[PDB]
Amino acid sequence: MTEYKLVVVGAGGVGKSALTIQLIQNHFVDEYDPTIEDSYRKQVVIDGETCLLDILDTAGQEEYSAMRDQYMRTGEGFLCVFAINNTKSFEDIHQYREQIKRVKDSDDVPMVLVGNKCDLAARTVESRQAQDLARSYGIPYIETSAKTRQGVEDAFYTLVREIRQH
Ligand SMILES: Nc1nc2c(ncn2[C@@H]2O[C@H](COP(=O)(O)OP(=O)(O)NP(=O)(O)O)[C@@H](O)[C@H]2O)c(=O)[nH]1
Ligand SMILES: C1CNCCNCCNCCN1
Ligand SMILES: [Ca+2]
Ligand SMILES: [Ca+2]
Ligand SMILES: [Ca+2]
Ligand SMILES: [Ca+2]
Ligand SMILES: [Mg+2]
Ligand SMILES: [Zn+2]
C-alpha cells in the first residue's frame, strides 16, 4: 500500500502534537509537553485508497533538535501549523517554509497551512490574512481545532491530496 510521509512543523505550543494525537488517537491533549521528535503511524482509508500515514511530529521549541532538518528530509508533505491566537507563530511560518524548501531542495513541496486553535476566541490572525499567505505559497489554508476535532481530518487528508497532485 501507499505510505504518505507527513511532517508537522511550526512554532512551539501551536498544537502540532495535539493535532497529530487527535488525528491518530482520537483525544485532545490538554497539557503542554514540548516534543523532541515523535513518530506516529496509522493505516487509514482516504478517498477509497487504503493509506499508511507516517507522521513526524517535530519540535517547535527552537532548542530541539539542532538538526530537526535531518528528520524532515524524508518528509513528502508538510503541515505548517500556527495558532490563530498567536501572531508570532503566524509570522514564524515563513521560516518553517524556508526550512522545508532547504531540506527538500525544492520550492515545490506538498504543504498545507494550518491555523490551529480555531475554537479559541482570542483571534489575532484573521482567516483572510492566512488565506493570502497560503495563496502566495500556492497551498491550501485550513483552520483546525485539536480540541474540538474541527478541520483535523481535513488538514491531514488535504495534505495527502496535495501530495497526490504532486
Ligand atoms: N484550545 C486549544 N488548545 C489547543 C489546541 N491545540 C493545542 N492546544 C493546547 O496548546 C498547548 C500546546 O499544544 P502542543 O500540541 O503540545 O503544541 P506543540 O506545537 O506540539 N508544542 P511543541 O512544539 O513544543 O512540541 C497544549 O496545552 C494543548 O492542549 C487547539 O486546537 N485548541
Ligand atoms: C519534492 C520536490 N519535488 C520537485 C520535483 N518533482 C518530482 C519529484 N517528486 C518527489 C519529490 N518531491
Ligand atoms: Ca485530554
Ligand atoms: Ca538542502
Ligand atoms: Ca490584525
Ligand atoms: Ca471521522
Ligand atoms: Mg509537540
Ligand atoms: Zn517532487
Curated annotation (Swiss-Prot):
UniProt-reported outcome of changing P34G: No effect on interaction with PLCE1
Phenotype upon changing V29A: No effect on interaction with PLCE1
Modification type N-acetylmethionine: residues: M1
Catalytic activity: GTP + H2O = GDP + phosphate + H(+)
Motif (Effector region): 32-40
Name of the protein in question: GTPase HRas
Cited Gene3D superfamilies: P-loop containing nucleotide triphosphate hydrolases
